[PDB]
Amino acid sequence: HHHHHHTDPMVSKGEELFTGVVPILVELDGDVNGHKFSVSGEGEGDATYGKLTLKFICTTGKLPVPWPTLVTTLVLCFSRYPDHMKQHDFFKSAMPEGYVQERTIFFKDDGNYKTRAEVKFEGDTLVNRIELKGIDFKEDGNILGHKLEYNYNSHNVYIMADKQKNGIKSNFKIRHNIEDGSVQLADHYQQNTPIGDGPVLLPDNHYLSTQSKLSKDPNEKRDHMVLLEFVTAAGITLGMDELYK
């Protein structure tokens, strides 16, 4: 699994927290053009396989934006980092004290989300607590008019160190499929910083390869999303010239 046996005791510490299946709670408070809503999510993460299983419920009634637009906002510490890359796993290294994750998400020709989250352990539970603010949306556009398909694409998200912040940054493009066959671009800008003052791992440039499947619970009457997601780190090669040459 294993996941204690690394020569680096800092790596060992972070990896230990994510051995096995870890329960997850997600809490989001949102306001988009004054449309207020809340989401609660539950499930588990198995970082050894890069695997996330989560069910989200809108606890205020009808979600006023399409569920796919919230996927990126609603725990990259469950990414599978290859053994030769484990020195570049910022997310696990910040645990259990945790990290702040902040984004601005620009929906092209529409409004923007600004998000601030804190991701940390509460006992055995990995908790993602989020505030989301959206402004300048078209009230009958693709987001507030619910014109997006209920599905999700696969991505390569590039991570860079942000050294003077002692953290990381990323910018990446998500396309949401529009029901007429077109696409709604959501351009993501992201930064993460540790919550503790302890040492963290600042990574070399690399990327996260993501894939997500959205489904519905056939017995659930509340507005909700079921998410099955896999995330794997990649983009750094090993030695020696090469192991397989």
Short mmCIF file of all heavy atoms in Angstrom, two decimals, residues 16-68:
data_model
loop_
_atom_site.label_atom_id
_atom_site.label_comp_id
_atom_site.label_asym_id
_atom_site.label_seq_id
_atom_site.Cartn_x
_atom_site.Cartn_y
_atom_site.Cartn_z
N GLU A 16 2.02 8.09 5.55
CA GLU A 16 1.32 7.36 6.62
C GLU A 16 -0.13 7.82 6.85
O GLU A 16 -1.02 7.00 7.12
CB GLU A 16 2.08 7.52 7.94
CG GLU A 16 3.10 6.45 8.27
CD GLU A 16 3.35 6.34 9.78
OE1 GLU A 16 2.40 6.56 10.58
OE2 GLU A 16 4.51 6.09 10.17
N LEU A 17 -0.37 9.13 6.78
CA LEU A 17 -1.71 9.65 7.03
C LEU A 17 -2.70 9.19 5.97
O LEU A 17 -3.91 9.18 6.22
CB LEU A 17 -1.68 11.21 7.09
CG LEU A 17 -1.02 11.78 8.34
CD1 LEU A 17 -0.91 13.30 8.24
CD2 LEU A 17 -1.84 11.38 9.53
N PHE A 18 -2.19 8.84 4.79
CA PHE A 18 -3.04 8.53 3.64
C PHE A 18 -2.99 7.07 3.18
O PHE A 18 -3.53 6.72 2.12
CB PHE A 18 -2.72 9.47 2.49
CG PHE A 18 -3.18 10.85 2.75
CD1 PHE A 18 -2.36 11.78 3.40
CD2 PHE A 18 -4.46 11.22 2.40
CE1 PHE A 18 -2.82 13.07 3.67
CE2 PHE A 18 -4.94 12.52 2.69
CZ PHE A 18 -4.10 13.44 3.30
N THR A 19 -2.36 6.25 4.01
CA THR A 19 -2.45 4.80 3.88
C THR A 19 -3.86 4.35 4.23
O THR A 19 -4.45 4.76 5.22
CB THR A 19 -1.40 4.13 4.79
OG1 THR A 19 -0.15 4.16 4.10
CG2 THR A 19 -1.77 2.68 5.10
N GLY A 20 -4.42 3.50 3.42
CA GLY A 20 -5.76 3.06 3.68
C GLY A 20 -6.81 4.04 3.21
O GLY A 20 -6.55 5.08 2.59
N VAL A 21 -8.03 3.68 3.53
CA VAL A 21 -9.19 4.41 3.11
C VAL A 21 -9.51 5.47 4.16
O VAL A 21 -9.60 5.16 5.35
CB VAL A 21 -10.35 3.46 2.94
CG1 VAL A 21 -11.60 4.22 2.69
CG2 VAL A 21 -10.03 2.50 1.78
N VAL A 22 -9.60 6.73 3.75
CA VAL A 22 -9.75 7.85 4.65
C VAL A 22 -11.13 8.45 4.43
O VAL A 22 -11.48 8.80 3.30
CB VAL A 22 -8.66 8.91 4.38
CG1 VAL A 22 -8.94 10.22 5.16
CG2 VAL A 22 -7.27 8.40 4.64
N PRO A 23 -11.97 8.62 5.49
CA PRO A 23 -13.27 9.27 5.34
C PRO A 23 -13.11 10.74 5.00
O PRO A 23 -12.19 11.40 5.50
CB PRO A 23 -13.93 9.14 6.73
CG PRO A 23 -13.09 8.18 7.45
CD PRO A 23 -11.70 8.15 6.86
N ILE A 24 -14.02 11.26 4.19
CA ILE A 24 -13.98 12.66 3.77
C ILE A 24 -15.30 13.38 4.04
O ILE A 24 -16.38 12.80 3.81
CB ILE A 24 -13.66 12.72 2.24
CG1 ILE A 24 -12.30 12.13 1.94
CG2 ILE A 24 -13.76 14.21 1.77
CD1 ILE A 24 -12.08 11.93 0.40
N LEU A 25 -15.20 14.62 4.52
CA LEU A 25 -16.36 15.50 4.61
C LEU A 25 -16.06 16.80 3.87
O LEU A 25 -14.99 17.37 4.02
CB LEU A 25 -16.73 15.80 6.09
CG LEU A 25 -17.87 16.80 6.31
CD1 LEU A 25 -19.27 16.33 5.82
CD2 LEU A 25 -17.96 17.18 7.81
N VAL A 26 -17.00 17.22 3.06
CA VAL A 26 -16.88 18.48 2.32
C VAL A 26 -18.03 19.43 2.72
O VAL A 26 -19.18 18.99 2.71
CB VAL A 26 -16.86 18.21 0.78
CG1 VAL A 26 -16.68 19.52 0.00
CG2 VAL A 26 -15.68 17.24 0.44
N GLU A 27 -17.72 20.69 3.02
CA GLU A 27 -18.81 21.63 3.37
C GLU A 27 -18.61 22.87 2.56
O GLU A 27 -17.53 23.45 2.65
CB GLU A 27 -18.80 21.96 4.89
CG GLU A 27 -19.09 20.76 5.77
CD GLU A 27 -20.56 20.36 5.76
OE1 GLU A 27 -21.41 21.26 5.63
OE2 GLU A 27 -20.88 19.16 5.83
N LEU A 28 -19.62 23.32 1.83
CA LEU A 28 -19.49 24.51 0.99
C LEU A 28 -20.62 25.50 1.30
O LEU A 28 -21.79 25.14 1.31
CB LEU A 28 -19.48 24.13 -0.52
CG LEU A 28 -19.39 25.33 -1.48
CD1 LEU A 28 -18.66 24.93 -2.74
CD2 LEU A 28 -20.75 25.88 -1.86
N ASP A 29 -20.25 26.74 1.55
CA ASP A 29 -21.25 27.78 1.59
C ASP A 29 -21.06 28.65 0.36
O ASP A 29 -19.97 29.14 0.10
CB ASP A 29 -21.16 28.60 2.87
CG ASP A 29 -21.75 27.88 4.07
OD1 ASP A 29 -22.70 27.06 3.96
OD2 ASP A 29 -21.27 28.16 5.19
N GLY A 30 -22.16 28.85 -0.39
CA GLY A 30 -22.03 29.58 -1.63
C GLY A 30 -23.02 30.71 -1.82
O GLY A 30 -24.10 30.72 -1.24
N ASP A 31 -22.63 31.66 -2.66
CA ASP A 31 -23.48 32.80 -3.03
C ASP A 31 -23.07 33.17 -4.45
O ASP A 31 -21.96 33.64 -4.63
CB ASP A 31 -23.28 33.97 -2.04
CG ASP A 31 -24.10 35.20 -2.39
OD1 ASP A 31 -24.39 35.44 -3.58
OD2 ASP A 31 -24.40 35.99 -1.46
N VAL A 32 -23.98 32.96 -5.40
CA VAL A 32 -23.71 33.30 -6.81
C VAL A 32 -24.79 34.29 -7.24
O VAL A 32 -25.94 33.93 -7.33
CB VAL A 32 -23.70 32.02 -7.72
CG1 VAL A 32 -23.58 32.40 -9.23
CG2 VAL A 32 -22.55 31.06 -7.33
N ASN A 33 -24.39 35.51 -7.56
CA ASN A 33 -25.36 36.58 -7.89
C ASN A 33 -26.46 36.68 -6.84
O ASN A 33 -27.60 36.94 -7.20
CB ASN A 33 -26.00 36.35 -9.27
CG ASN A 33 -25.11 36.80 -10.44
OD1 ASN A 33 -23.89 36.65 -10.42
ND2 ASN A 33 -25.74 37.33 -11.48
N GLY A 34 -26.13 36.48 -5.57
CA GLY A 34 -27.13 36.58 -4.49
C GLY A 34 -27.96 35.32 -4.28
O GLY A 34 -28.73 35.23 -3.33
N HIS A 35 -27.81 34.32 -5.16
CA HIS A 35 -28.46 33.04 -4.98
C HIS A 35 -27.63 32.23 -4.00
O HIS A 35 -26.55 31.74 -4.36
CB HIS A 35 -28.60 32.25 -6.31
CG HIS A 35 -29.33 32.99 -7.40
ND1 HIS A 35 -30.70 32.91 -7.57
CD2 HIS A 35 -28.88 33.81 -8.38
CE1 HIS A 35 -31.05 33.65 -8.62
NE2 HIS A 35 -29.96 34.22 -9.11
N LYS A 36 -28.10 32.09 -2.78
CA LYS A 36 -27.37 31.46 -1.68
C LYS A 36 -27.71 29.98 -1.61
O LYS A 36 -28.83 29.56 -1.92
CB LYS A 36 -27.68 32.16 -0.35
CG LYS A 36 -27.25 33.60 -0.35
CD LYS A 36 -27.71 34.32 0.92
CE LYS A 36 -27.32 35.77 0.95
NZ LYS A 36 -25.85 35.93 1.01
N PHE A 37 -26.69 29.18 -1.27
CA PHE A 37 -26.88 27.74 -1.22
C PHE A 37 -25.80 27.11 -0.39
O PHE A 37 -24.78 27.72 -0.15
CB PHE A 37 -26.88 27.14 -2.64
CG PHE A 37 -25.56 27.30 -3.40
CD1 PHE A 37 -24.60 26.29 -3.41
CD2 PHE A 37 -25.31 28.47 -4.11
CE1 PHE A 37 -23.40 26.47 -4.13
CE2 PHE A 37 -24.13 28.67 -4.80
CZ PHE A 37 -23.19 27.65 -4.84
N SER A 38 -26.05 25.89 0.03
CA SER A 38 -25.05 25.11 0.77
C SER A 38 -24.96 23.71 0.20
O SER A 38 -25.95 23.15 -0.26
CB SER A 38 -25.39 25.06 2.28
OG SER A 38 -25.29 26.35 2.88
N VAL A 39 -23.75 23.14 0.26
CA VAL A 39 -23.53 21.74 -0.12
C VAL A 39 -22.79 20.98 0.98
O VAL A 39 -21.83 21.48 1.54
CB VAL A 39 -22.71 21.66 -1.46
CG1 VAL A 39 -22.34 20.22 -1.80
CG2 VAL A 39 -23.53 22.25 -2.60
N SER A 40 -23.20 19.75 1.20
CA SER A 40 -22.49 18.85 2.10
C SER A 40 -22.16 17.60 1.31
O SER A 40 -23.04 17.01 0.63
CB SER A 40 -23.33 18.50 3.36
OG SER A 40 -23.46 19.59 4.23
N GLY A 41 -20.90 17.18 1.39
CA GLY A 41 -20.45 15.97 0.70
C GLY A 41 -19.82 14.96 1.66
O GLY A 41 -19.18 15.35 2.65
N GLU A 42 -19.97 13.67 1.35
CA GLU A 42 -19.37 12.62 2.15
C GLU A 42 -18.86 11.52 1.27
O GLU A 42 -19.47 11.17 0.25
CB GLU A 42 -20.40 12.02 3.15
CG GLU A 42 -20.87 12.92 4.20
CD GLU A 42 -21.84 12.19 5.13
OE1 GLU A 42 -21.81 10.93 5.24
OE2 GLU A 42 -22.63 12.89 5.73
N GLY A 43 -17.76 10.91 1.72
CA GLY A 43 -17.26 9.71 1.08
C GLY A 43 -15.92 9.30 1.55
O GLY A 43 -15.62 9.45 2.75
N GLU A 44 -15.07 8.81 0.66
CA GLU A 44 -13.76 8.40 1.12
C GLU A 44 -12.76 8.50 0.02
O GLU A 44 -13.10 8.52 -1.18
CB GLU A 44 -13.79 6.96 1.66
CG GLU A 44 -14.10 5.93 0.58
CD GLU A 44 -14.47 4.56 1.16
OE1 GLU A 44 -14.97 4.52 2.29
OE2 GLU A 44 -14.26 3.54 0.46
N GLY A 45 -11.51 8.51 0.44
CA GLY A 45 -10.39 8.61 -0.46
C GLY A 45 -9.34 7.56 -0.19
O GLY A 45 -9.08 7.22 0.95
N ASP A 46 -8.75 7.03 -1.25
CA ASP A 46 -7.77 5.95 -1.16
C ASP A 46 -6.62 6.41 -2.03
O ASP A 46 -6.56 6.09 -3.24
CB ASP A 46 -8.37 4.60 -1.63
CG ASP A 46 -7.54 3.42 -1.26
OD1 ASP A 46 -6.35 3.58 -0.92
OD2 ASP A 46 -8.12 2.30 -1.34
N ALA A 47 -5.71 7.19 -1.46
CA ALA A 47 -4.65 7.81 -2.27
C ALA A 47 -3.70 6.84 -2.95
O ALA A 47 -3.09 7.18 -3.96
CB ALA A 47 -3.84 8.81 -1.39
N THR A 48 -3.54 5.67 -2.35
CA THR A 48 -2.76 4.61 -3.00
C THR A 48 -3.23 4.34 -4.41
O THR A 48 -2.40 3.99 -5.26
CB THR A 48 -2.86 3.32 -2.19
OG1 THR A 48 -2.27 3.54 -0.90
CG2 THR A 48 -2.10 2.15 -2.87
N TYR A 49 -4.52 4.46 -4.68
CA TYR A 49 -5.05 4.25 -6.03
C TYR A 49 -5.52 5.56 -6.67
O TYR A 49 -6.14 5.53 -7.75
CB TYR A 49 -6.19 3.21 -5.99
CG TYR A 49 -5.79 1.98 -5.20
CD1 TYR A 49 -6.17 1.85 -3.88
CD2 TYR A 49 -5.01 0.97 -5.78
CE1 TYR A 49 -5.78 0.75 -3.12
CE2 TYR A 49 -4.61 -0.12 -5.02
CZ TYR A 49 -5.01 -0.23 -3.70
OH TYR A 49 -4.63 -1.32 -2.94
N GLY A 50 -5.25 6.69 -6.02
CA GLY A 50 -5.67 8.00 -6.54
C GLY A 50 -7.19 8.14 -6.57
O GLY A 50 -7.71 8.91 -7.38
N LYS A 51 -7.89 7.44 -5.68
CA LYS A 51 -9.30 7.19 -5.88
C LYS A 51 -10.18 7.96 -4.91
O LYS A 51 -10.00 7.89 -3.72
CB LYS A 51 -9.59 5.69 -5.74
CG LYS A 51 -11.01 5.29 -5.96
CD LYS A 51 -11.10 3.78 -5.95
CE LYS A 51 -12.48 3.33 -6.26
NZ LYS A 51 -12.47 1.83 -6.43
N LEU A 52 -11.15 8.69 -5.47
CA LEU A 52 -12.12 9.43 -4.68
C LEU A 52 -13.54 9.02 -4.98
O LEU A 52 -13.95 8.94 -6.12
CB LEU A 52 -11.99 10.90 -4.97
CG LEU A 52 -10.84 11.68 -4.41
CD1 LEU A 52 -11.22 13.07 -4.77
CD2 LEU A 52 -10.74 11.58 -2.89
N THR A 53 -14.32 8.78 -3.95
CA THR A 53 -15.75 8.49 -4.10
C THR A 53 -16.56 9.44 -3.19
O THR A 53 -16.43 9.41 -1.95
CB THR A 53 -16.07 7.02 -3.76
OG1 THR A 53 -15.49 6.64 -2.51
CG2 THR A 53 -15.44 6.08 -4.74
N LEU A 54 -17.33 10.33 -3.79
CA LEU A 54 -18.05 11.32 -2.97
C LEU A 54 -19.47 11.57 -3.42
O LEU A 54 -19.73 11.57 -4.63
CB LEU A 54 -17.28 12.63 -3.00
CG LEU A 54 -15.89 12.74 -2.37
CD1 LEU A 54 -15.29 14.13 -2.72
CD2 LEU A 54 -15.95 12.58 -0.85
N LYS A 55 -20.40 11.76 -2.48
CA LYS A 55 -21.77 12.13 -2.81
C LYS A 55 -22.05 13.47 -2.18
O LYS A 55 -21.84 13.66 -0.96
CB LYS A 55 -22.77 11.08 -2.32
CG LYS A 55 -24.22 11.49 -2.58
CD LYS A 55 -25.19 10.42 -2.02
CE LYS A 55 -26.63 10.95 -2.06
NZ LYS A 55 -27.59 9.98 -1.44
N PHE A 56 -22.50 14.42 -2.98
CA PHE A 56 -22.77 15.79 -2.55
C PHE A 56 -24.26 16.05 -2.56
O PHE A 56 -24.95 15.62 -3.51
CB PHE A 56 -22.05 16.81 -3.46
CG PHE A 56 -20.58 16.61 -3.56
CD1 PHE A 56 -20.03 15.93 -4.65
CD2 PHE A 56 -19.72 17.11 -2.57
CE1 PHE A 56 -18.67 15.74 -4.74
CE2 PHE A 56 -18.34 16.93 -2.65
CZ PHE A 56 -17.81 16.26 -3.75
N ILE A 57 -24.77 16.76 -1.54
CA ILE A 57 -26.17 17.10 -1.47
C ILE A 57 -26.28 18.60 -1.36
O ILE A 57 -25.51 19.22 -0.59
CB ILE A 57 -26.83 16.43 -0.22
CG1 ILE A 57 -26.83 14.91 -0.37
CG2 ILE A 57 -28.26 16.93 -0.01
CD1 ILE A 57 -27.03 14.16 0.90
N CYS A 58 -27.18 19.23 -2.13
CA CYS A 58 -27.51 20.63 -1.89
C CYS A 58 -28.52 20.68 -0.71
O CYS A 58 -29.60 20.16 -0.82
CB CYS A 58 -28.05 21.34 -3.16
SG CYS A 58 -28.47 23.06 -2.78
N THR A 59 -28.07 21.24 0.40
CA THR A 59 -28.84 21.21 1.65
C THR A 59 -29.71 22.43 1.84
O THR A 59 -30.23 22.67 2.92
CB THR A 59 -27.91 21.11 2.85
OG1 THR A 59 -27.04 22.25 2.85
CG2 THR A 59 -27.08 19.83 2.74
N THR A 60 -29.85 23.22 0.80
CA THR A 60 -30.70 24.40 0.86
C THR A 60 -31.81 24.30 -0.15
O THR A 60 -32.60 25.23 -0.26
CB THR A 60 -29.91 25.69 0.62
OG1 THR A 60 -29.02 25.46 -0.49
CG2 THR A 60 -29.05 26.03 1.83
N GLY A 61 -31.88 23.18 -0.88
CA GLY A 61 -32.92 22.96 -1.86
C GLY A 61 -32.31 22.76 -3.26
O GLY A 61 -31.44 21.92 -3.44
N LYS A 62 -32.82 23.50 -4.25
CA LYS A 62 -32.32 23.40 -5.64
C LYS A 62 -30.96 24.08 -5.74
O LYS A 62 -30.81 25.23 -5.37
CB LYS A 62 -33.33 24.06 -6.61
CG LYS A 62 -32.85 24.05 -8.06
CD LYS A 62 -33.94 24.41 -9.09
CE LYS A 62 -33.39 24.22 -10.52
NZ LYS A 62 -32.84 22.81 -10.78
N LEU A 63 -29.97 23.39 -6.33
CA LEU A 63 -28.68 24.04 -6.56
C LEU A 63 -28.87 25.09 -7.69
O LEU A 63 -29.38 24.75 -8.76
CB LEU A 63 -27.63 22.99 -6.96
CG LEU A 63 -26.18 23.50 -6.97
CD1 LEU A 63 -25.69 23.78 -5.53
CD2 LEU A 63 -25.25 22.51 -7.64
N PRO A 64 -28.48 26.36 -7.49
CA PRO A 64 -28.77 27.40 -8.49
C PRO A 64 -27.71 27.49 -9.61
O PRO A 64 -27.77 28.38 -10.47
CB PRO A 64 -28.82 28.68 -7.63
CG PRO A 64 -27.78 28.43 -6.59
CD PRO A 64 -27.95 26.95 -6.24
N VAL A 65 -26.72 26.59 -9.58
CA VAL A 65 -25.73 26.50 -10.66
C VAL A 65 -25.62 25.02 -11.03
O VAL A 65 -26.02 24.18 -10.24
CB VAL A 65 -24.36 27.07 -10.24
CG1 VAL A 65 -24.47 28.53 -9.87
CG2 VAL A 65 -23.75 26.18 -9.11
N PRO A 66 -25.08 24.69 -12.21
CA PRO A 66 -24.98 23.28 -12.57
C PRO A 66 -23.91 22.57 -11.73
O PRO A 66 -22.82 23.11 -11.49
CB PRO A 66 -24.59 23.31 -14.06
CG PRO A 66 -24.97 24.69 -14.52
CD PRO A 66 -24.77 25.57 -13.35
N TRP A 67 -24.24 21.37 -11.27
CA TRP A 67 -23.28 20.58 -10.48
C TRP A 67 -21.86 20.50 -11.09
O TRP A 67 -20.86 20.57 -10.39
CB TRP A 67 -23.79 19.15 -10.26
CG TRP A 67 -24.82 19.07 -9.15
CD1 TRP A 67 -26.17 18.87 -9.28
CD2 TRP A 67 -24.56 19.22 -7.76
NE1 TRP A 67 -26.76 18.88 -8.04
CE2 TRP A 67 -25.80 19.08 -7.09
CE3 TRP A 67 -23.39 19.40 -7.01
CZ2 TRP A 67 -25.92 19.14 -5.70
CZ3 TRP A 67 -23.51 19.48 -5.63
CH2 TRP A 67 -24.77 19.32 -4.99
N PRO A 68 -21.73 20.31 -12.44
CA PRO A 68 -20.34 20.19 -12.96
C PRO A 68 -19.48 21.40 -12.68
O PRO A 68 -18.26 21.28 -12.55
CB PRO A 68 -20.56 20.03 -14.48
CG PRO A 68 -21.87 19.27 -14.51
CD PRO A 68 -22.73 19.93 -13.46
#
